[PDB]
Ligand binder design. Sequence first.
Ligand SMILES: Cc1ncc(COP(=O)(O)O)c(CNc2cccc(C(=O)O)c2)c1O
Ligand SMILES: Cc1ncc(COP(=O)(O)O)c(CNc2cccc(C(=O)O)c2)c1O
Ligand SMILES: Cc1ncc(COP(=O)(O)O)c(CNc2cccc(C(=O)O)c2)c1O
Ligand SMILES: Cc1ncc(COP(=O)(O)O)c(CNc2cccc(C(=O)O)c2)c1O
Ligand SMILES: [Ca+2]
Ligand SMILES: [Ca+2]
Ligand SMILES: [Ca+2]
Ligand SMILES: [Ca+2]
Ligand SMILES: [Ca+2]
Ligand SMILES: [Ca+2]
Ligand SMILES: [Ca+2]
Ligand SMILES: [Ca+2]
Lengths: 379, 379, 379, 379
Amino acid sequence: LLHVGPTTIKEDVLVAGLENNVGFTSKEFVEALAYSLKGLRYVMGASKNYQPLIIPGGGTSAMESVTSLLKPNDKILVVSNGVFGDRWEQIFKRYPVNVKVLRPSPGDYVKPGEVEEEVRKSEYKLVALTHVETSTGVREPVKDVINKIRKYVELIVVDGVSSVGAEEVKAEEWNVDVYLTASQKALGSAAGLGLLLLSPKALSILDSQNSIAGYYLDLRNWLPVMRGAEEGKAAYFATPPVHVILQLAEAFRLIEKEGIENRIKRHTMVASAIRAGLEALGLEIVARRPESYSNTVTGVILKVADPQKVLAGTVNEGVEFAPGVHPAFKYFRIGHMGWVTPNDAIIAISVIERTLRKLGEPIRFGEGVKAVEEVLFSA
Amino acid sequence: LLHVGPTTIKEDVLVAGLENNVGFTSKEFVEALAYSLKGLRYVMGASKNYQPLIIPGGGTSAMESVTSLLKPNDKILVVSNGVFGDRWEQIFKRYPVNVKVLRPSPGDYVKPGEVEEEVRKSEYKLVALTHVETSTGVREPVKDVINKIRKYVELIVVDGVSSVGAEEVKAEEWNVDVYLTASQKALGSAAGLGLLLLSPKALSILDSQNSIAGYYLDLRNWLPVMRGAEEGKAAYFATPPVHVILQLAEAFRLIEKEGIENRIKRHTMVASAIRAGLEALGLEIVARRPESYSNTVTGVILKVADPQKVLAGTVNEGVEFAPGVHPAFKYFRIGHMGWVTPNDAIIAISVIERTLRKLGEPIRFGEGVKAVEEVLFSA
Amino acid sequence: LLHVGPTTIKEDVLVAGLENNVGFTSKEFVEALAYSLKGLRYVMGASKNYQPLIIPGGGTSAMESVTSLLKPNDKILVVSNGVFGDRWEQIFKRYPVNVKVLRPSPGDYVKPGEVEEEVRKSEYKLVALTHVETSTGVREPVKDVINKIRKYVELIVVDGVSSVGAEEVKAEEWNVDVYLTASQKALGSAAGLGLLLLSPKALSILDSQNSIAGYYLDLRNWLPVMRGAEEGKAAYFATPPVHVILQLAEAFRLIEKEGIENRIKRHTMVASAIRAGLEALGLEIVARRPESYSNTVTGVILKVADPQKVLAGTVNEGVEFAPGVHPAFKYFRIGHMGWVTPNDAIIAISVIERTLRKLGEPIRFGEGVKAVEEVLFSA
Amino acid sequence: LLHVGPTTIKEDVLVAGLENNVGFTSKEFVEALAYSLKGLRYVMGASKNYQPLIIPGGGTSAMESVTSLLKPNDKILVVSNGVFGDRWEQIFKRYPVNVKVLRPSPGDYVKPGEVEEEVRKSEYKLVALTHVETSTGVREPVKDVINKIRKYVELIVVDGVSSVGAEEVKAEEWNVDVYLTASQKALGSAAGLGLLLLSPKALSILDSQNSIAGYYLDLRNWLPVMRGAEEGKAAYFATPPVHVILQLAEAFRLIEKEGIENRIKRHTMVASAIRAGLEALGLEIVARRPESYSNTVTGVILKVADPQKVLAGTVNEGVEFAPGVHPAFKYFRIGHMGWVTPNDAIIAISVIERTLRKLGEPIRFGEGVKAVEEVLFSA
Ligand SMILES: Cc1ncc(COP(=O)(O)O)c(CNc2cccc(C(=O)O)c2)c1O
Ligand SMILES: Cc1ncc(COP(=O)(O)O)c(CNc2cccc(C(=O)O)c2)c1O
Ligand SMILES: Cc1ncc(COP(=O)(O)O)c(CNc2cccc(C(=O)O)c2)c1O
Ligand SMILES: Cc1ncc(COP(=O)(O)O)c(CNc2cccc(C(=O)O)c2)c1O
Ligand SMILES: [Ca+2]
Ligand SMILES: [Ca+2]
Ligand SMILES: [Ca+2]
Ligand SMILES: [Ca+2]
Ligand SMILES: [Ca+2]
Ligand SMILES: [Ca+2]
Ligand SMILES: [Ca+2]
Ligand SMILES: [Ca+2]
């Protein structure tokens, strides 16, 4: 069997979807969409000059919709740290475009200098980055990368599926052209939506040029719906996931009530506490470089125990554990994103200690939970 | 302003989505997906030889995913009775294919003989039909069309967004290659999913040939998820709308409990009652030919009153009314599909009588409600 | 079998109860209780000098809690128009008190003069009235009764279970000492609570005297909880139905948003429309005197059809029908209270027409629904 | 301020109450009541000869309803270990009965021999016990008490509000005449109901004798409702909390799915783990005698820190902490009952360690969490 840990959704978020006479023209729907659109500007750090869109699907449909900005034979550079970086390449194989991929050593990340070198050597229409690579837990220093490449490339896109709402994101200040995410990860809402924030530059391409996009994923077709909503008007392109968007509006209400800076600090603390627990047990982290330890995903190397058995025996344990699928390592991953609290840190390390002791993975029993406690106490 | 009436969702359906620890690998999700896949075979009248898929989006994403069955320069005949027939052509303009469209007089439908004539004259890879054309309330005699064209064309696709779960559908008996619908219409569940049933012939194309499809809407990419689910296995292509699918499973449970034959009879009675009400008021129906009066949508011609004012004054009135957007007629539309009951028939005609009397549309006040009562009594 | 029609609850009301970490000391609970307490002053027409209480149970526990105001051998006059008036007497048999009951002819009501005559003849500590007698649909002219008896009696209590939130109620202006109701009737919330509004006179009895009350239903024990809540403080006597009270707060929000005067007008219109439908069918109303036709309950006399069969064949019909249990009449009752709309009037009469036609009760088929339409149109 | 920790309710339990067209005559309600009645026999260990009742209110209304079994001047012995034992005496002061109370030293419990001595010296109609005394966390050895007193007393009643569903209960085997609980404690459902299980002997009293009971709390009045439900019949005495009972049925489904023996073991393990944590910190438990350490409540003595500050700083910390209200001790209490898991044990001790360290209560920081881990590993 396959077992990937699901991001826990606050009941308030889910319950916001229980309105049984709401459609895409309902004032309640239009208001939730307009609210979510502003919520997206807020979590991504951008002013009204940046255009938000919320489309059906997820991170993957959002990624593919970037073809809305491309023309035949356009040159694309993908900076891929693993599975989800590689998905850009799989998507672009379906399109008449030219793709080059940079990859680092397993579990590492592509340095800003290496990207800079490549964009000076060849002219690229588009550069794709992955803010956090979910398969390895590695955060790319996207700000540093962009500072170096901004003047050599027409467009920069960042996959923030595992970062937005949890890691610092400054789409406008960093001059990103498309920052995208999904509803079900670090935002902690129900699945079904892709979310995008476009620069004025990307928006001009939409408004004035043709593209290689299909029909459903051409952001041009969704623009009138998004623009209409902010003016309090209903418009129809294709039926969106109405109740999932009601749920998203409620997630954004909770996000705005906590405050994004506070949200980020919470993810830093929880992740730091979890990592301190892992280290005190003598467990090795998958991410090669400490400065890249993402605050949403941590890969945990096992020397003796079978990762698959760790996952099988922790299914009903109130944790978010998932398989490690990189040939270079034997590991499982801990998801720690969304509504995650200090108690989730304690639980994750406790569940880990007890499971690994049972399976004979050499660990310093007791030391993990104590180290977690220490971190949580000290801040 | 734009106001389209929303299909009322049974609360039980919505409430089935309130499970806050479910992801695409959860056995609860896998079971709901497998159940919904079987439910789709059931409402469409097909055996295990036909392959169901449930994908993110809606009717439009389902329609576009038909490109999964096409090759460059393939010849397509679209039989379009209005807006949603025309959407096939709009979708196919994004693809390297050759499209011819047959259209009838406004509010009429393309006769089976006219389609037969065209497919004998020229060779077509694909013929696209719309079972019920939502913009006009016209039901295409799809069975009759197919009987005549089956031996002259490789593939037949039917858009059943406004028919499946309400009109008779026999995908297997009629030998349709793709029968498709959405979650939010005559099935009466929450929005966010497209649904497809493929013949063995269409499935062989998927399994053995390349196509002009993009990435997200290539049915090949969803097949392992659908096949896995029916064997009780989780598989990942892209995150689906997990909770919308939980809701869909519950809608299919209610559909199977009523029985599809009974469901169809209910839609026939409610629609017949509503139409009898309209006629007794002296109101003219948009559909030109009575044999094509769909049992999910009825267009109502106004001679004096402004359709927009009818819609504005019936917003909180517990009905499903929508604008008429065909230049050839001045009208509004009544949606009567999903969980619709005899009481909905009475309400719709009563709300119509009272609104039109207020606005001076010449009608036989009182006679509508009486005629509805008569029909509901006699069945 | 027994079949009593349930008051339909807005989903928003129910959904307000889905908070899974709320207890009697939670700020959310205290706020909902304080809100509901004010909501009770509002629907009953009283200033802050009147003391609201919300206790576990229903109308019956509220009625019994009136013993909190009594002493051994106190004299009580019950003005009983049927079953629920008679319940006062059944309750008081359990207590060392002296009870006299006035009853009118079946389906009539006790005139104000008849009560006045009795309270001048003997001295009574307490007079009990029923605002609307649910078993017959008869509204007592409580204002007129009180105007006549106020100076001759120490305490006046009014059972408003079937009136509060639907009929005009002015507890303060009319000088009532206890006005009581339940959560599940004309207020349209979930069952589980009795609700009481006490005059300063009744409150002084609580604060300064002993009583014959038991433990759970001694309003003295609940007072500190109610007083605490309005000061934003939690207090414990016995655990209340926490989530039912969350639901009640939401019902009061909806009531206050509509406005009580508007609520009353809606009940008048719906009831008048239903009665006009009944009359046009040639059906006789149970209430003997038109000025007493309650706007929450209407008894419908059948000359031929069996009331029990009317009820059996209308169970899934979206109506609120209940048995007639008074030996003097052959009838069923229509409940029309709470969130009831003009559409409910149309439905009730339509369901009645179709059911009675099937069962051979002589009626003027078609005429009922037309008369309802006319009433709803004319206001 | 007063802050008592709320028992966390599984969302599934709450969500079972979202049926908006259900009343006391609905077959859905009757089925939920019948199911809950059987569920009550199951959790209390009794065959069909024992009669369950579910009444509005809570533990307190259930306790008072025991007056249904009493006659004027009946002699009662209350075995009270604290607040909730003392509530028997407070209730009985409202009734013409003779009460004697046995009390132990603070935080201790009345030995079976001490009760035996008293019932042999004087003749008692009724002996009242508290299975777990919530105010001190002390479990009375009710089986041992009953074995000694059974032949000397007519009736034995046990308050199991904090024991039923968590501690071993054998109502039939131990020959208890009334075993009672509430919906919101160790059963973990929504508040609003009292629950009783009566012996054949107590039932004969109901069926054949008069009593000193009031009206609402006379178990005679509820019996036809309970008997009717198990024969699949609706009956009316007073409106029950319909949706709270739907929720209760769902709680009983979850209890029966786990199995009562397993439920008991879970409470033993979680409580043992929590206590091991407390001891390893050097914290003293309020219960004087280890054999009486209840598995639902533990009192924690503080030597230096203010209990009130512990409560104030742990409000949003996902725990169930409550004040200690016995003058003889300075303490707070930990609730660990219902759906409580091993993770709740870890969290409670961690939250305690971190809070007390902050407030300078002398503890062995780190040692609590380790001891909890050890216990959870070894079971
Ligand atoms: C960085 C990143 N980019 C793109 C996607 C694709 O999103 P959708 O699935 O919404 O199309 C993701 C999604 N991440 C994802 C999805 C499913 C499983 C796991 C796992 O942890 O094993 C991770 C992701 O984490
Ligand atoms: C026959 C038909 N085909 C395709 C679609 C597209 O479905 P999605 O929107 O789920 O992609 C539809 C949708 N039907 C539809 C959708 C929105 C509004 C109205 C209206 O009545 O104006 C009708 C439809 O009715
Ligand atoms: C006027 C009146 N007074 C007291 C009560 C008792 O309330 P509780 O049940 O909440 O204790 C009521 C309740 N009314 C009631 C209850 C059950 C059935 C029916 C029916 O219409 O057949 C009516 C009532 O309508
Ligand atoms: C043993 C026991 N007996 C009777 C009751 C009364 O139950 P109701 O409240 O449902 O009538 C209880 C209630 N237990 C209870 C209730 C409220 C607060 C606290 C606290 O921890 O301070 C404890 C109890 O714990
Ligand atoms: Ca909440
Ligand atoms: Ca239901
Ligand atoms: Ca035919
Ligand atoms: Ca015409
Ligand atoms: Ca709402
Ligand atoms: Ca569940
Ligand atoms: Ca023993
Ligand atoms: Ca001590």
